[PDB]
């Protein structure tokens, strides 16, 4: 009757209540989801406060626990999720200040409003009508007077809050045995205590810097090209010596710019893949979206599942009968119960985030074996960046072509791959510097290291000479536009979106080197190849019983990291753009001031 044993039936005590109670839970959040009702906003409420109770008394009861007897890897990593600290040297008024920052910082950011000029009625908000005047116009001037307006009633209010949430997170990462809220959030970064295999939380730092360095000259290279055509863009408005400006990259922030496409055509004469007409004179359905999708992961490999999940999820316009949301969604219930939320609509993007839900989904069913702490990935990154290579790989014509999407008259050339690399380098690659920045900044504020008041114009200097972005105005120091964004609002990191890429990368080019597939890297295709596969269902079923970089291990072969799939990935695109626009001024130079 030793000590692991208790250990082991209270995992799997835990484990079953709080899967009935996780349960219930999801249960009652997705029929709230599909029909809106008080009533079952009060049923989750009432279920997730008493789970929260619950793994709060589980917790308690597992501190008894030594996490140092035990050898097995499974046990001691479950015990270390369940002895976590949380609340263990944090005072009731210092928590309920913590949860009252919260929530201020997130009802004032959310409920946003730009209503300066005119009457007072006319108020534009932030998701649905901001950034159509802030991507999709022409006016420069009404780009930098409306994000000046969105910054300036922001900034000041969202600045002193946002330090407190800093201090005090520190604070708890002090008492929880942890150097920072970066250092907290490092900590599912980080494989320490396996041999062979060993990870630093510093080690992490080290990765982003090297990818950034090794990323730095082809960004620089396609902001370039990106400045070339907005010269003729915008006639006398950058200087060729000056930086890109602010409002300029569609977003406020400067996220995505797939809004900036249209000014960005490389050939009108090419056309690009499109079978969503086909789908028209085809006439398929929400159903036979799925069953497409069905068919590529089972020309993958990967086994088909319940008949009674596609009943269950309902897919089509729910209407005004009852109130639900459009955003499509997964929902891994528990016990062998997934449902999937949107309305289908006849679009390409449809079947992209079809294919997106069905890799998520995939991959939950996956890890089903694995116990309920451990039904998760490996991080929080890992599932983001399986669901978007599914969404990814879905894009390919050949596919099309044998499933009869595509019609067989359509031909690939040259120009029009060109143009399809263009575009996910606009997606993909583009967004990779600004996550970086923007996480190299948070980790400074949440380190605690760079002073308050320094930021007169540091955020600015560095988007300026990091990245080669310039503000069209200075602001003062109330203002606090990094954190302004959406996820540092509401604590959402983004080291999860750099890893997701990163991971993302390295799967593609495991699958695309791995399926039998030769030639160019963004023409890859992985139906008709179960080795891929087999190779990917290996880690699958892994779940988070292991570690992160065992989990890369036994799919890639390498024990880290390189930046070569994103080599392999663009350098036909690379090509082109160093045979391009190498003519014309590469790079940045933070001399321009405004």
């Known amino acids: 009757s030793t000590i692991e044993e208790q250990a082991k039936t209270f995992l799997d005590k835990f484990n079953h209540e709080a899967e009935d109670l996780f349960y219930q839970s999801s249960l009652a959040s997705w029929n709230y989801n599909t029909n809106i009702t008080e009533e079952n906003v009060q049923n989750m409420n009432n279920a997730g406060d008493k789970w929260s109770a619950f793994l709060k008394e ?11 007897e035990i050898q097995n890897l499974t046990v001691k990593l479950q015990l270390q999720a369940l002895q976590q600290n949380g609340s263990s040297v944090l005072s009731e008024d210092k928590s309920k200040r913590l949860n009252t920052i919260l929530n ?12 300066n000029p005119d009457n007072p009625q006319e108020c534009l908000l932030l998701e649905p009508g901001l950034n159509e005047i802030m991507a999709n116009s022409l006016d420069y001037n009404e780009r930098l007077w409306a994000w000046e307006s969105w910054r300036s009633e922001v900034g000041k209010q969202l600045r002193p809050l946002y330090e407190e949430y800093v201090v005090l997170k520190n604070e708890m990462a002090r008492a929880n045995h942890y150097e920072d809220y970066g250092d907290y959030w490092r900590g599912d970064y980080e494989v320490n205590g396996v041999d062979g295999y060993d990870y630093s939380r510093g080690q992490l730092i080290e990765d982003v810097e090297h990818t950034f360095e090794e990323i730095k000259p082809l960004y620089e290279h396609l902001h370039a090209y990106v400045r070339a055509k907005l010269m003729n863009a915008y006639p006398s408005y950058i200087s060729p010596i000056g930086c890109l400006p602010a409002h300029l990259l569609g977003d406020m922030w400067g996220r995505f710019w797939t809004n900036l496409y249209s000014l960005t055509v490389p050939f009108g004469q090419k056309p690009n893949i499109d ?22 992961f089972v020309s993958v490999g990967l086994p088909n599942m319940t008949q009674g999940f596609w009943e269950n999820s309902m897919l089509t316009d729910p209407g005004n009968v009852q109130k639900a949301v459009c955003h499509p969604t997964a929902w891994d219930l528990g016990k062998g119960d997934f449902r999937i939320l949107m309305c289908t609509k006849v ?21 089903a074996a694995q116990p309920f702490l451990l039904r998760n990935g490996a991080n929080e990154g890992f599932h983001e960046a399986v669901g978007e290579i599914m969404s990814l790989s879905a894009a390919t014509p050949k596919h099309l072509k044998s499933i009869g999407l595509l019609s067989p008259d359509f031909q690939e050339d040259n120009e029009t791959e060109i143009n399809f690399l263009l575009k996910q380098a606009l997606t993909i690659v583009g967004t990779l510097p600004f996550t970086y920045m923007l996480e190299k900044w948070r980790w400074m504020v949440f380190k605690g290291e760079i002073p308050k008041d320094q930021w007169m114009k540091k955020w600015w200097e560095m988007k300026r000479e990091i990245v080669g972005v310039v503000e069209p105005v200075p602001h003062d120091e109330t203002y606090c536009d990094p954190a302004s964004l959406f996820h540092v609002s509401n604590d959402y990191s983004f080291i999860r979106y750099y890893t997701r890429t990163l991971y993302q990368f390295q799967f593609q080019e495991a699958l695309c080197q791995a399926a ?79």
């Not at 589980?58 to 140092?68: D, E, H, I, K, R």
């Open 516 to 594: 039998k597939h030769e030639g160019p890297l963004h023409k890859c295709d992985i139906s008709n190849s179960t080795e891929a596969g087999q190779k990917l269902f290996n880690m699958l079923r892994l779940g988070k019983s292991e570690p992160w970089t065992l989990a890369l291990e036994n799919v890639v072969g390498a024990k880290n990291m390189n930046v070569r799939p994103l080599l392999n990935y663009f350098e036909p695109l690379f090509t082109w753009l160093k045979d391009q626009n190498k003519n014309s001024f590469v790079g940045w130079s933070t001399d321009w001031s405004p």
């Open 104 to 115: 201020t910082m997130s009802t004032i950011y959310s409920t946003g409003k730009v209503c």
């Open 275 to 296: 079978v969503t007409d086909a789908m028209v004179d085809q006439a398929w359905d929400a159903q036979r979206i799925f069953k497409e999708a069905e068919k590529f």
């Open 58 to 68: 589980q917790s308690t009861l597992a501190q008894m626990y030594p996490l140092q």
């Open 347 to 367: 679009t390409m993007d449809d079947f992209l985030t079809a294919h997106h839900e069905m890799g998520h989904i995939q991959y939950d069913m996956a890890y």
